[PDB]
Design a protein around this ligand. Structure first.
Ligand code: CLA
Ligand code: CLA
Ligand code: CLA
Ligand code: CLA
Ligand code: CLA
Ligand code: CLA
Ligand code: CLA
Ligand code: CLA
Ligand SMILES: CC1=C(/C=C/C(C)=C/C=C/C(C)=C/C=C/C=C(C)/C=C/C=C(C)/C=C/C2=C(C)CCCC2(C)C)C(C)(C)CCC1
Ligand SMILES: CC1=C(C/C=C(\C)CCC[C@H](C)CCC[C@H](C)CCCC(C)C)C(=O)c2ccccc2C1=O
Ligand code: SF4
Ligand code: SF4
Lengths: 81, 728, 31, 137, 39, 150, 39
């Protein structure tokens, strides 16, 4: 659906992965900082636009962003009907 | 013992540390009372509620006693005593300095000041008040009782505070209150009435030297003058010992109508009224079960009423009514609101005080005041219902109950509701604008009044009729009809109407129907927020997240304004509309075909001339034939001694536009402007340490709606206040 | 004396209470 | 897929014609105890013993129940969710990590990345008459 | 006539004719019904 | 006891599953079997064109003039025409999800198809015109009862 | 009237009513077209 954007400032507290109710994140193995596993978006197709995730990102200039696209569908719009 | 106040945030652990930014100020005035948000304990909560109630009562006593005192030393009462017609009561004399010197409201007898409109002297025409010194003592008593019960609150919180089982005896609560409070107070007031009120009322028929009229001590044990009138009232003959009450036909009677010598009704009826009510709900309030092993087990009554459509009936409702508080709050608020508005809708056809229908200024002031309070608080009742829904509930004790049975089929209810609202809405308003177009289109035969296409509310007419001839058969021991707007003779005094029968033609139809329309949509909004409070078809975390929050991000498109109190925002807008047009309708009719002047033939020359049958059918007429009259003097109503009060109607528009400014705009814009001003101030080394931050969007919405309501209501009260001054 | 639309009234009291009450008391016994 | 459902009379927030003709979601777990609980479509019910089939039209309700209701309250952490096609095909959309860890594995899905500072960012000032955005490095 | 309205003029025919008509029609189609349902 | 599952968004209230109502709804020309779409259109047109002329017959702007009968006739004529136009174009653009939402225990009929809809519209036109003229004839002689004077 | 003919009597309805009718009808059938052709 919409697009997701990842950066390097992921400290690795993993408050975003516990905040997104849409299963669009996972901590893939990293090496750079003490994190060793940095967040990423494997399952964008279920993005919702709630962006409760970066509100859970404590990093200065929060490490995740979401570029809110234009190719919406019944899934991205979230209708029970 | 003064070392404790200046330690702010004493009740919250978070905002107690320090004011980082201006936000810390705002919340200080926001969480000072919801101490349910402080702990889980309850005895503390109850104690706080008791003390707060005592404080409110204290300020009550204070303000009433002070208003008395003003009435004693700066009010032309005792001069207005001998003549309640040719003198207009007043108070609050103007202070003679620059700016307020021309405002001397001179009301005859040289008494300047401010021509008030609250009709307290009317009470002081029934209480029989001669000299202001007794009133001085009254104020002293009021204030000392205020201080007394405040001290009592301090004691019952700091030294001996009540325990916890002291809360939930609603049985003894109802018994004590219902019986002891209401019945004993009412019968005591009736005893005061018969002893003093009607005697001096008798003595106010022909100028019987008011102060010379004796004092109550001259009637406590002096039964001679009490034996002058009412021969059965020698002592009483005490025939109640003999169970005979036929002797007492002197004072304790039943007339039921207007007394053209008092400007109000016959006070004897009110006295016997109060007697009957007293004993009636005394024996009522003696119902429920208490400490003598006798009475209803009320938590079993509701268990019994179930059936096929019921499911399981009213099972399991007391945990809600006692464990939680917001429930009780909401229901009692709704009931009080309704009760108040019926009171308003009530006391313009049965004036219960002397000189009420003859005094055409206090009436609508009291009416509109109470009417506004009614709605203005029933919406709050509904809001507290919703706050109960979000704060207090249970999945366990709420299986299939009459409560749960609606929350399972809400969609059908609300869909049919929307259906009804749409139907009524255009069925009324589009019809109205249709007739508007027809009148503007040289097709007058397509109008809808009597002189055109017909419709007549026969139901109201027939009910009023069957009310007209009530006495004799339905009311044998009754003399006159209950009122005179239904039927009877046009009752009046002087060249001044008291009450005439009211006519319901064609224009009544759409007016009542749009009343119902707006009430329907109001219920729609409020109940919608009610049901869709915890879970929506898209948001399943509402109760999991709160009820005071702005939005849930730009998911699903937009989601802003999905809490509940925004529902009540929209609802309060709508109820504003409702009550505003309601008071419009009431004022215009009761100044168009109920009120005016009178000739020796009883010829009622009304103020306006019956304008509904002429213009209250098309929109352009509604602005012409109402506000042309409602303002044509306010433009020039200033510019002399008893005119100088340039009213803030000219002033309220400004606050209204300033209001609407807050609504249409976001906040990031203001935040950036703030940051630029901060840059400048920091360049000149004046940067305020506490960093300013723009308002939160909910805060801005709140201040916008507040200013909106304030401006509107100020405008309208200015309107009809000056309008009545032009005739009263 | 004699009557008016009140006879349309006494007609109106029928066709809900007695009407469908008798209808149910009939259809109870499985046509 | 178990022939059993919690004790629940009925309601009107059920399914629509979009459900049995476009998609259904399914969630199951293990509740050897029967406790009263809430549901997102309005109303309450009480669970069954062992396998517990809850079938639904959307996805977020199952996630809300699993996260906020099941393991947050009753400590059941073996619920599985599936997406049912209009013909009957089923997709094990989750658990795509088995144990619901949300951070653990010996190796994970590795395709694509962006580890780039934002101060230096591609712009329409440079990317012109293309169809892409700032996602270049 | 009297203080009532036209009603006794025309309310007999439908009760006299058409209601018997539908009665017997429905009855006849009832007495030929299939199995095992019938209304 | 729902239709197939007590958790579905449907209820067994005794207004949508009463034997009286289901018998009364099944045998309507929209559902009663043993007929052609042609007859369906004919009958629906008959009924509607037979009642949809009064609502403006004595109600139109020519209400009390000495012609308003044929005026209302022409009005309802144009009305049924444009209604047929509407349904025909609906058929023209009809076939996304070529079904109708089914709640009657059985499917209604094979009436659910484009050319079926077209034939139905034709029969609607014919029956509507017919109901129109026959109502106009009933209403023509104001003396229709005056000759009877009963 | 004037030296022109009847025309201003009846030339508004077709422009007022029927031309909008065909306009919107054609438009609606256009906004549902198949692939990849369309007129
Ligand atoms: C209920 C609240 C209340 C309110 C709103 C007011 C308001 C007012 N009082 Mg007041 N008053 C009150 C209670 C109240 N009073 C009580 C309880 C008493 C009895 C102790 C008085 C006794 C009182 C006196 C004796 C006077 C006022 C005066 C005034 C006016 C000017 C106030 C001033 O300069 O102080 C008072 C200033 C002096 C006493 C000097 C003002 C309208 C003054 C005024 O303008 O006359 C009405 C004035 O002379 N009041
Ligand atoms: C802006 C300058 C100014 C000032 C300092 C005052 C001062 C006063 N006015 Mg006032 N007034 C003003 C402008 C002003 N007026 C204007 C422009 C108008 C409209 C033309 C009025 C209309 C007005 C009325 C109608 C009344 C006052 C009253 C008062 C007195 C009590 C109210 C008070 O001060 O607050 C409250 C302070 C205390 C209660 C203490 C006080 C002497 C009242 C008065 O004279 O009796 C008390 C009163 O009834 N004023
Ligand atoms: C300085 C401003 C000022 C103040 C302090 C008051 C104060 C008061 N007015 Mg008042 N009034 C004012 C301006 C003011 N008025 C103006 C400008 C007008 C229009 C000319 C009036 C018209 C007016 C009327 C018509 C009446 C009052 C009444 C009252 C008393 C009721 C108390 C009350 O409303 O509590 C709340 C406090 C505030 C609203 C402040 C109180 C003493 C009433 C009264 O005397 O009742 C016995 C009453 O009937 N006033
Ligand atoms: C006949 C005995 C009697 C009487 C007259 C009252 C009278 C009252 N009770 Mg009360 N009460 C009683 C017995 C009685 N109580 C008993 C036996 C219990 C124990 C269950 C309580 C427990 C109780 C609680 C818990 C509360 C009251 C409160 C009140 C007050 C309600 C406010 C009101 O009436 O405004 C009168 C207003 C004016 C006169 C002005 C009122 C003064 C409320 C309160 O705090 O008072 C404000 C309150 O919260 N009562
Ligand atoms: C002569 C007057 C009178 C009498 C005989 C009674 C008699 C009774 N009252 Mg009672 N009551 C009265 C006046 C009276 N009431 C008044 C004026 C009030 C308001 C203050 C109450 C308030 C009241 C309450 C709140 C309760 C009773 C209860 C009772 C019963 C308990 C028996 C007992 O010990 O009471 C002896 C009383 C007297 C000798 C007096 C009894 C039937 C109790 C009961 O059984 O409730 C179910 C109870 O809880 N009464
Ligand atoms: C006796 C009447 C009464 C009482 C005791 C309360 C009491 C309360 N209201 Mg409330 N309310 C009332 C009438 C009342 N309301 C009416 C009539 C309305 C409609 C106009 C509202 C509308 C209302 C809203 C919209 C809100 C409250 C809230 C609250 C709570 C916090 C208030 C606070 O600390 O203010 C501090 C703030 C200021 C003084 C400003 C508190 C329990 C708030 C809440 O939910 O808190 C739990 C809240 O958001 N009330
Ligand atoms: C020009 C003013 C105006 C008009 C004409 C309407 C018209 C309408 N509003 Mg509305 N509204 C307005 C101003 C207005 N609003 C403002 C300023 C607010 C904010 C205070 C709202 C808040 C509001 C809410 C919250 C709701 C409506 C609803 C409605 C609808 C009621 C149905 C009806 O009778 O149809 C009118 C048809 C014709 C006039 C033709 C209708 C479409 C309700 C709705 O959906 O009802 C179905 C509803 O829920 N409106
Ligand atoms: C919303 C309520 C409402 C109602 C009840 C009516 C009712 C009526 N209108 Mg009307 N009208 C309305 C709103 C309404 N109008 C509005 C909002 C407008 C736009 C300005 C018009 C414009 C309008 C015109 C221009 C004319 C009427 C006419 C009529 C009459 C013909 C009835 C008819 O053809 O119905 C048909 C109903 C069905 C087919 C069903 C009837 C009395 C005609 C008439 O008799 O003149 C008054 C006429 O010439 N109306
Ligand atoms: C509405 C209102 C108001 C008013 C109020 C009122 C008016 C109230 C009332 C109240 C009252 C009116 C009260 C009273 C009370 C009383 C009582 C409660 C009584 C009791 C009694 C008793 C208890 C007795 C005792 C005794 C004696 C004395 C002797 C011996 C024997 C005995 C012991 C029995 C106000 C303005 C505020 C505000 C607004 C609104
Ligand atoms: C003006 C405005 C601001 C700016 C207002 C701010 C930042 C508040 C600043 C504090 C105020 C200015 C202090 C009030 C000062 C007192 C009122 C004293 C001044 C005297 C006046 C009464 C004349 C917002 O932050 C905002 C946010 C969301 C929606 C709309 C708006 C909005 O409209
Ligand atoms: S984006 Fe935030 S929650 Fe996610 S890994 Fe980085 S710091 Fe942790
Ligand atoms: S809106 Fe935010 S939390 Fe929700 S799916 Fe998209 S990135 Fe994740």
């Amino acid at each position: 659906s919409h697009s997701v954007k990842i950066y390097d400032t992921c400290i690795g507290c993993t408050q975003c992965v516990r905040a997104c109710p849409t299963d669009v994140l996972e901590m893939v193995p990293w090496d750079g900082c003490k994190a060793g596993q940095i967040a990423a978006s494997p399952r964008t197709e279920d993005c919702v636009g709630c962006k409760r995730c970066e509100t859970a990102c404590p990093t200065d200039f929060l490490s995740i962003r979401v570029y809110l696209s234009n190719a919406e569908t019944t899934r991205s719009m979230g209708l029970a009907y | 013992s003064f070392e404790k106040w200046g330690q702010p945030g004493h009740f919250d652990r978070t905002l107690a540390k320090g004011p980082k930014t201006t936000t810390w100020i705002w919340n200080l005035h926001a969480l000072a009372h919801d101490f349910d948000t402080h702990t889980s304990d309850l005895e503390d909560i109850s104690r706080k509620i008791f003390a707060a109630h005592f404080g409110q009562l204290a300020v009550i006593f204070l303000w009433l006693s002070g208003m008395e005192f003003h009435g004693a030393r700066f009010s032309n009462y005792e001069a207005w005593l001998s003549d309640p017609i040719g003198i207009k009561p007043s108070a609050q004399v103007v202070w003679p300095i620059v700016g307020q010197d021309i405002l001397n409201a001179d009301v005859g007898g040289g008494f300047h000041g401010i021509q008030i409109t609250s009709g307290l002297f009317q009470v002081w025409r029934a209480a029989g008040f001669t000299n202001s010194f007794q009133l001085y003592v009254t104020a002293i008593g009021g204030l000392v009782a205020a201080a007394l019960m405040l001290f009592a609150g301090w004691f019952h919180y700091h030294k001996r505070a009540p325990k916890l089982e002291w809360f939930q005896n609603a049985e003894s609560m109802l018994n004590h209150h219902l019986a002891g409070l209401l019945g004993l107070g009412c019968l005591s007031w009736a005893g005061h009435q018969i002893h003093v009120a009607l005697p001096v009322n008798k003595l106010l028929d022909a100028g019987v030297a008011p102060k010379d009229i004796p004092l109550p001590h001259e009637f406590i044990l002096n039964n001679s003058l009490m034996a002058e009138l009412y021969p059965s009232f020698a002592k009483g003959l005490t025939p109640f010992w003999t169970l005979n009450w036929g002797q007492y036909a002197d004072f304790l009677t039943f007339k039921g109508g207007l007394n053209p010598v008092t400007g109000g009704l016959w006070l004897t009826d009110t006295a016997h009224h109060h007697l009957a009510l007293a004993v009636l709900f005394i024996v009522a309030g003696h119902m429920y079960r208490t400490n003598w092993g006798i009475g209803h087990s009320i938590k079993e009554i509701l268990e019994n009423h179930k059936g096929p459509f019921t499911g399981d009936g009213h099972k399991g409702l007391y945990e809600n009514m006692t464990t939680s508080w917001h429930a009780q709050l909401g229901t009692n608020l709704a009931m009080l609101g309704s009760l108040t508005i019926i009171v308003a809708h009530h006391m313009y056809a049965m004036p219960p005080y002397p000189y009420l229908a003859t005094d055409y200024a206090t009436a609508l002031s009291i009416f509109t005041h109470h009417m506004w309070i009614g709605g203005f608080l029933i919406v709050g009742g509904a809001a507290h219902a919703t706050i109960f829904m979000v704060r207090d509930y249970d999945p366990a004790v709420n299986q299939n109950n009459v409560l749960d049975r609606v929350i399972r089929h809400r969609d059908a209810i609300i869909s049919h509701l929307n259906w009804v609202c749409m139907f009524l809405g255009f069925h009324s308003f589009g019809l109205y604008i249709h007739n508007d177009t027809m009148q503007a289109l040289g097709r007058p035969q397509d109008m809808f009044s009597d002189t055109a296409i017909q419709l007549q509310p026969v139901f109201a007419q027939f009910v009023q009729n069957i009310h007209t001839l009530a006495p004799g058969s339905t009311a044998p021991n009754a003399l006159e009809p209950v009122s005179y707007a239904f039927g009877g003779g046009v009752v009046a005094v002087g060249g001044k109407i008291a009450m005439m029968p009211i006519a319901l033609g064609t224009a009544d139809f759409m007016i009542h129907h749009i009343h119902a329309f707006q009430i329907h949509v109001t219920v729609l909004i409020l109940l919608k927020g009610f049901l869709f409070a915890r879970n929506s078809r898209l948001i399943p975390d509402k109760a999991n997240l709160g009820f005071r929050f702005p939005c849930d991000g730009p998911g699903r498109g937009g989601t802003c304004q999905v809490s509940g109190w925004d529902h009540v925002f929209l609802g309060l807008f709508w109820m504003f509309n409702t009550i505003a047009i309601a008071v419009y309708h009431f004022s215009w009719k009761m100044q168009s075909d109920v009120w005016g002047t009178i000739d020796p033939d009883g010829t009622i020359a009304h103020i306006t001339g019956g304008n509904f049958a002429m213009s209250a059918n098309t929109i352009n007429g509604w602005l012409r034939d109402y506000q042309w009259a409602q303002a044509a003097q306010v433009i020039q109503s200033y510019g002399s001694a008893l005119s100088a009060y340039g009213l803030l109607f000219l002033g309220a528009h400004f606050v209204w536009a300033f209001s609407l400014m807050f609504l249409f705009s976001g906040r990031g814009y203001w935040q950036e402007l703030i940051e630029s001003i901060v840059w400048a101030h920091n360049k000149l080394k004046v940067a305020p340490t506490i960093q300013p931050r723009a308002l939160s969007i909910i805060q801005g919405r709140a201040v916008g709606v507040a200013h909106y309501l304030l401006g509107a209501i100020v405008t309208i009260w200015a309107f009809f206040e000056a309008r009545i001054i032009s005739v009263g | 004396m004699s009557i008016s639309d009140t006879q349309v009234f006494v007609a109106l009291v029928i066709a809900l209470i007695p009407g469908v009450l008798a209808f149910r008391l009939a259809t109870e016994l499985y046509k | 897929l178990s022939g059993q459902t919690p004790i629940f009379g009925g309601s009107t927030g059920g399914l629509l014609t979009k459900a049995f003709r476009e998609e259904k979601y399914v969630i199951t777990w293990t509740s050897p105890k029967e406790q009263v609980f809430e549901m997102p479509t309005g109303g309450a019910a009480i669970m069954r013993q062992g396998p517990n089939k809850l079938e639904l039209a959307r996805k977020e309700y199952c996630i809300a129940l699993g996260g906020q209701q099941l393991r947050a309250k009753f400590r059941i952490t073996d619920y599985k969710i599936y997406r049912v096609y209009p013909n009957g095909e089923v997709q094990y959309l989750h658990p795509s990590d088995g144990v619901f860890p949300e951070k653990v594995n010996e190796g994970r899905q590795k395709v694509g990345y962006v580890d780039r500072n934002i101060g230096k960012n591609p712009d329409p000032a440079k990317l012109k008459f293309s169809g892409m955005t700032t996602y270049n490095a | 006539m009297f203080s009532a309205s036209f009603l006794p003029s025309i309310l007999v025919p439908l009760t006299g004719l058409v209601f018997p008509a539908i009665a017997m029609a429905l009855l006849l189609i009832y007495v030929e019904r299939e199995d095992p349902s019938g209304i | 006891p729902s239709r197939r599952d007590p958790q579905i968004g449907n209820l067994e209230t005794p207004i949508n599953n009463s034997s009286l109502v289901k018998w009364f709804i099944n045998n309507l020309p929209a559902y009663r079997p043993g007929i052609t779409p042609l007859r369906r259109g004919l009958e629906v047109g008959m009924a509607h064109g037979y009642w949809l002329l009064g609502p403006f017959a004595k109600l139109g702007p020519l209400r009390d003039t000495d012609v308003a009968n044929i005026a209302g006739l022409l009005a309802t004529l144009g009305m049924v025409v444009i209604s047929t136009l509407a349904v025909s174009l609906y058929a023209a653009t009809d076939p996304p999800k070529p079904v109708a939402t089914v709640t009657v225990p059985n499917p209604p009929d094979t009436f659910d198809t484009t050319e079926g809809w077209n034939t139905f519209a034709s029969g609607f036109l014919i029956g509507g015109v017919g109901g129109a003229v026959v109502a106009y004839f009933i209403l023509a002689n104001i003396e229709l009862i005056q000759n009877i004077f009963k």
